[PDB]
Amino acid sequence: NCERTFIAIKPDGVQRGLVGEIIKRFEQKGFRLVGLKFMQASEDLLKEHYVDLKDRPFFAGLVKYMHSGPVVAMVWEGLNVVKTGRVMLGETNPADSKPGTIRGDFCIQVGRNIIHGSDSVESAEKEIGLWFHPEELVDYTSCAQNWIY
Amino acid sequence: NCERTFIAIKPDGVQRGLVGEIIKRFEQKGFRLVGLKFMQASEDLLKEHYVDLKDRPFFAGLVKYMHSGPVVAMVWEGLNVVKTGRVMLGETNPADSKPGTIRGDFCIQVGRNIIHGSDSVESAEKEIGLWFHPEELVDYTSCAQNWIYE
Amino acid sequence: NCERTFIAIKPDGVQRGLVGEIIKRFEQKGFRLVGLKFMQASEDLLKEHYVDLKDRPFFAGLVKYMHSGPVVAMVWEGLNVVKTGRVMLGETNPADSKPGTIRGDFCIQVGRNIIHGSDSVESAEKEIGLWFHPEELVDYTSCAQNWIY
Amino acid sequence: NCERTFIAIKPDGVQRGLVGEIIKRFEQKGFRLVGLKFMQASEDLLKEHYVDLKDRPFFAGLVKYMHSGPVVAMVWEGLNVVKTGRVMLGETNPADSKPGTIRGDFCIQVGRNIIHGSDSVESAEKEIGLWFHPEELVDYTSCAQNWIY
Amino acid sequence: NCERTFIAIKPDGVQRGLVGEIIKRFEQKGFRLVGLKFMQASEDLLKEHYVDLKDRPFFAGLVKYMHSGPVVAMVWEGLNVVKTGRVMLGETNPADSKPGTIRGDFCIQVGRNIIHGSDSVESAEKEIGLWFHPEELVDYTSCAQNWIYE
Amino acid sequence: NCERTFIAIKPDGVQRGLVGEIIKRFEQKGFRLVGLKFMQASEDLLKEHYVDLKDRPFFAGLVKYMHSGPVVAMVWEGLNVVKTGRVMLGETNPADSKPGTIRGDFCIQVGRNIIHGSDSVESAEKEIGLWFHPEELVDYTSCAQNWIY
Numbered sequence: 001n002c003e004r005t006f007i008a009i010k011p012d013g014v015q016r017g018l019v020g021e022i023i024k025r026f027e028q029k030g031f032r033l034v035g036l037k038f039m040q041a042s043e044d045l046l047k048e049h050y051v052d053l054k055d056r057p058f059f060a061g062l063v064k065y066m067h068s069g070p071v072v073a074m075v076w077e078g079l080n081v082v083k084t085g086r087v088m089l090g091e092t093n094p095a096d097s098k099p100g101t102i103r104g105d106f107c108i109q110v111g112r113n114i115i116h117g118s119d120s121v122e123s124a125e126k127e128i129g130l131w132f133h134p135e136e137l138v139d140y141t142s143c144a145q146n147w148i149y
Numbered sequence: 150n151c152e153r154t155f156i157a158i159k160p161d162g163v164q165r166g167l168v169g170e171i172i173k174r175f176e177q178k179g180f181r182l183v184g185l186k187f188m189q190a191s192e193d194l195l196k197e198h199y200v201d202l203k204d205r206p207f208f209a210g211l212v213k214y215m216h217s218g219p220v221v222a223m224v225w226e227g228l229n230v231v232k233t234g235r236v237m238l239g240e241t242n243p244a245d246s247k248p249g250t251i252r253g254d255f256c257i258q259v260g261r262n263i264i265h266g267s268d269s270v271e272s273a274e275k276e277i278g279l280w281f282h283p284e285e286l287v288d289y290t291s292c293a294q295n296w297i298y299e
Numbered sequence: 300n301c302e303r304t305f306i307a308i309k310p311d312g313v314q315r316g317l318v319g320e321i322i323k324r325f326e327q328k329g330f331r332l333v334g335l336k337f338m339q340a341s342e343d344l345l346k347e348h349y350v351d352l353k354d355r356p357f358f359a360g361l362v363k364y365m366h367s368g369p370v371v372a373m374v375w376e377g378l379n380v381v382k383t384g385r386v387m388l389g390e391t392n393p394a395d396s397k398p399g400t401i402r403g404d405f406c407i408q409v410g411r412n413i414i415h416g417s418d419s420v421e422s423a424e425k426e427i428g429l430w431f432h433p434e435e436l437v438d439y440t441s442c443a444q445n446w447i448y
Numbered sequence: 449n450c451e452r453t454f455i456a457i458k459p460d461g462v463q464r465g466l467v468g469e470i471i472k473r474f475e476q477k478g479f480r481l482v483g484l485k486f487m488q489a490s491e492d493l494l495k496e497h498y499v500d501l502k503d504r505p506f507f508a509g510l511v512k513y514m515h516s517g518p519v520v521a522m523v524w525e526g527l528n529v530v531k532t533g534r535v536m537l538g539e540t541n542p543a544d545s546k547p548g549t550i551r552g553d554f555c556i557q558v559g560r561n562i563i564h565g566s567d568s569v570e571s572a573e574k575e576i577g578l579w580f581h582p583e584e585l586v587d588y589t590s591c592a593q594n595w596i597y
Numbered sequence: 598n599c600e601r602t603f604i605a606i607k608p609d610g611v612q613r614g615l616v617g618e619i620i621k622r623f624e625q626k627g628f629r630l631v632g633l634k635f636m637q638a639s640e641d642l643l644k645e646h647y648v649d650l651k652d653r654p655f656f657a658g659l660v661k662y663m664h665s666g667p668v669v670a671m672v673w674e675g676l677n678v679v680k681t682g683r684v685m686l687g688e689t690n691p692a693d694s695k696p697g698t699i700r701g702d703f704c705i706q707v708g709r710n711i712i713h714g715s716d717s718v719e720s721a722e723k724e725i726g727l728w729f730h731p732e733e734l735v736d737y738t739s740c741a742q743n744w745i746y747e
Numbered sequence: 748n749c750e751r752t753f754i755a756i757k758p759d760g761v762q763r764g765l766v767g768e769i770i771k772r773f774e775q776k777g778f779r780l781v782g783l784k785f786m787q788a789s790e791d792l793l794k795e796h797y798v799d800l801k802d803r804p805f806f807a808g809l810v811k812y813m814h815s816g817p818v819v820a821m822v823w824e825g826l827n828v829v830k831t832g833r834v835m836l837g838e839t840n841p842a843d844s845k846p847g848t849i850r851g852d853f854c855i856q857v858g859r860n861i862i863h864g865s866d867s868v869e870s871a872e873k874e875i876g877l878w879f880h881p882e883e884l885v886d887y888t889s890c891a892q893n894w895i896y
């Protein structure tokens with residue numbers, strides 16, 4: 001219920017003008033915006049973030065693509081926000097993503113797939129700690145909370 | 150082909166500002182608005198409406214939640230409007246609801262799931278009769294009818 | 300602040316599928332929905348409602364047009380809802396209506412201008428009393444009230 | 449990656465005002481508009497286009513429906529545009545079509561299902577050649593190409 | 598009600614993905630789509646089209662910009678479609694264009710102002726004749742005509 | 748045309764779910780997102796920011812309202828972004844704001860007017876320096892730059 005997930009709008013997402021469109025979907029869904037910042041990620045940050053993919057054939061090109069422009073880093077709160085957030089994003093490969101999902105509606109190739117979401121609560125807490133100082137995560141009550149829960 | 154279903158935007162749906170957004174989806178889909186009204190439902194109306202759920206652990210809290218604010222009661226007409234309407238709403242639990250559906254796009258918890266739709270033609274006719282007098286259901290021809298149905 | 304206006308989506312507005320679109324604009328603006336109903340208006344109701352236009356050349360045709368299909372009658376509440384509501388509708392003649400307004404965005408000819416709004420607080424209270432029984436007007440507090448006022 | 453599909457907005461789609469709405473979905477997805485034209489299709493064109501359905505009970509009525517008003521014929525380019533285009537359209541019967549898809553969002557009956565897409569690369573090249581002269585298909589580079597691929 | 602205007606989405610408009618968005622505004626307004634085509638315009642066509650601006654300092658660069666990519670050429674029909682179309686586009690300089698208008702919502706600099714509309718009925722008929730063969734302009738009745746015009 | 752302006756989404760704007768909607772308008776207009784962050788502003792920051800309004804009757808209540816929840820602070824770049832940004836916001840009092848503008852579309856009372864924009868280039872550079880460290884302002888080229896200018 002106070003669960004948190006880390007959502008990152010990739011450089012292609014920013015370049016193609018989907019920041020507002022993506023944020024809008026999390027807002028209208030009911031989730032609470034906890035953190036938000038706009039930054040060019042360093043390669044050391046990206047390598048730690050994508051560490052499970054370290055020895056994959058695409059990993060070099062992934063780190064380059066993600067360093068190439070700025071990203072919108074975000075933190076969203078709510079019941080099953082990690083799982084439901086992943087569903088809203090759609091499948092990691094946009095080829096598999098359904099219409100209605102962010103990737104399904106807005107992108108084509110896996111190498112340029114506009115958005116990242118945390119795969120689990122464990123990954124979420126690691127990625128949140130990695131991308132944000134705790135001082136940057138804002139605590140407040142949504143005025144619509146009693147109508148969402 | 151002029152089958153009818155009952156749709157009710159719950160109090161959280163009204164409070165969160167989704168009335169127009171929800172109605173828009175039925176309009177752009179092609180279905181015809183037959184009835185529409187804004188009312189605070191009494192507990193006797195809600196208890197009859199949700200009578201199949203009478204002896205469920207949540208039933209007391211459901212009736213309270215639904216009494217707490219006003220609802221937009223509606224009646225929509227068209228081919229398989231009951232079944233297709235249910236699909237557009239998405240799964241009753243928003244956790245299962247797909248993006249693209251009303252619940253999937255706009256709500257999180259099952260207890261605050263913004264909208265009701267009739268589960269069958271049998272339930273639809275019972276719920277329509279329950280929520281509307283027959284005088285309130287307007288009959289007219291959509292100007293786009295020949296481009297929606299053959 | 301507890302001021303009310305009467306808004307009515309004309310038959311062409313209902314026929315062309317603008318009910319949700321119109322309602323959405325009042326919702327997102329911040330105004331509170333007080334009353335809403337869907338009815339075929341009788342000629343005696345329409346003649347009383349448009350009584351100031353009784354002896355105009357179009358009046359007969361206006362009353363027929365408004366009787367021809369159903370209308371969505373509404374009541375909205377908020378600070379200067381009558382004046383601001385009129386602004387959102389745009390000029391009565393759509394030829395004069397600005398893009399951004401309901402008539403400006405959605406209709407062309409004055410004879411088929413999709414929506415009515417009350418011109419003043421006086422007209423509003425007369426039109427509300429005329430179209431609604433007092434039992435049909437619902438009283439409640441918006442959860443966003445402290446962020447609107 | 450330079451694959452093309454043929455997309456036709458049927459007469460009901462044009463009549464109901466979905467041309468912009470449909471085109472918008474292909475644009476925001478990332479696909480490149482290659483060809484676009486507005487024409488009343490002849491019965492010989494329609495009979496050749498729907499030749500695989502020649503001896504079906506609905507075929508006469510299909511050809512009539514498609515001749516009844518104008519259509520927006522289109523050609524779109526991109527990676528798996530034929531397959532993904534089909535997915536975006538949704539199932540041919542709107543009864544089966546999912547919310548989020550064009551047919552799922554915008555139509556009800558199979559006989560009036562607003563849009564056609566090519567079922568395969570083979571059908572696409574036949575349908576493109578059938579509906580367009582090669583001079584009408586415009587070649588250019590999307591400014592967002594490096595962020596789509 | 599049978600008046601026609603020539604609307605054209607410039608190359609920047611096509612490149613930035615506003616074709617559907619622009620067309621949508623004319624559709625939802627009530628105007629009838631009469632002609633539509635996607636073409637790279639030749640310099641002789643553009644020079645004839647912008648002939649009143651022939652001896653302006655920007656004219657060379659205008660013709661180049663308009664030749665650089667494809668355009669969506671269109672023809673729309675309805676009551677005061679030329680005047681109202683111009684209003685919907687907004688002021689030619691986007692700096693002056695109001696929010697709600699196409700240029701006001703979607704572009705910044707006058708040199709890249711995404712759309713053209715005919716300034717008058719006279720210009721409209723010249724521009725329509727210039728950009729379209731008469732066989733390409735489709736005639737039909739909108740199913741919503743009786744709800745748009747009396 | 749490398750002007751920057753400071754735009755801030757007030758607490759009511761965040762609470763009512765307009766962050767994506769507001770950002771979308773700047774994106775689709777053509778302006779480049781330079782900085783973005785989500786923070787609860789301190790009273791010393793707000794008092795310095797609204798220093799020209801220091802001795803106004805509402806100033807105490809303004810500072811309280813702006814401290815009450817978090818804000819989305821932003822920096823946008825482009826030709827006349829300060830002036831055009833102000834136009835897109837609409838008049839400071841929503842009563843005067845036109846439909847089509849952010850305040851005109853989304854809010855009612857001056858005390859809860861959802862968004863701030865810089866009034867001039869001078870104020871913009873002061874407000875940017877005040878709300879952002881220079882390290883937080885990201886520099887990059889829009890892929891659509893040659894089609895915007």
Ligand SMILES: *S(=O)(=O)Oc1ccc(-c2c(-c3cccc(OC)c3)ncn2CC#C)cc1
Binds near residue numbers: 061063093113116117
């Ligand atoms: S995002 O969080 O989805 O980031 C991301 C991770 C992994 C992939 C990927 C790729 C791939 C292919 C071509 C080029 C790439 O980067 C330039 C990446 N292939 C498979 N996966 C999914 C996995 C695991 C893309 C994006």
Ligand SMILES: *S(=O)(=O)Oc1ccc(-c2c(-c3cccc(OC)c3)ncn2CC#C)cc1
Binds near residue numbers: 211
């Ligand atoms: S709506 O028409 O879906 O109304 C509604 C009916 C049933 C449920 C429900 C619940 C549930 C859980 C927690 C709290 C509740 O109300 C306060 C209700 N659990 C399962 N269902 C679906 C069934 C059967 C919610 C809403």
Ligand SMILES: *S(=O)(=O)Oc1ccc(-c2c(-c3cccc(OC)c3)ncn2CC#C)cc1
Binds near residue numbers: 352412747
């Ligand atoms: S609604 O409130 O817009 O109702 C309404 C009132 C008055 C007019 C109108 C007409 C006119 C012209 C042609 C046909 C008509 O009805 C069939 C009406 N001419 C001027 N006005 C504006 C005024 C006062 C239309 C609609």
Ligand SMILES: *S(=O)(=O)Oc1ccc(-c2c(-c3cccc(OC)c3)ncn2CC#C)cc1
Binds near residue numbers: 299540560561
């Ligand atoms: S479009 O490409 O969707 O065109 C189209 C092709 C086939 C069908 C169709 C029909 C059907 C039913 C009733 C009336 C019709 O036309 C007037 C067509 N039944 C099945 N299919 C799909 C197949 C195979 C509809 C539209």
Ligand SMILES: *S(=O)(=O)Oc1ccc(-c2c(-c3cccc(OC)c3)ncn2CC#C)cc1
Binds near residue numbers: 660710714
């Ligand atoms: S379109 O119809 O908007 O075509 C068009 C005509 C005139 C202008 C224009 C310019 C200008 C400035 C810099 C560069 C240009 O083209 C590359 C054009 N300056 C004033 N106007 C408006 C007039 C008259 C732009 C576009």
Ligand SMILES: *S(=O)(=O)Oc1ccc(-c2c(-c3cccc(OC)c3)ncn2CC#C)cc1
Binds near residue numbers: 808812840860
């Ligand atoms: S923002 O930049 O829009 O901040 C802002 C500044 C000033 C006003 C304002 C007020 C006013 C009235 C009642 C309550 C207030 O704050 C709680 C503020 N009265 C006039 N202005 C216009 C100016 C400047 C509102 C918002």
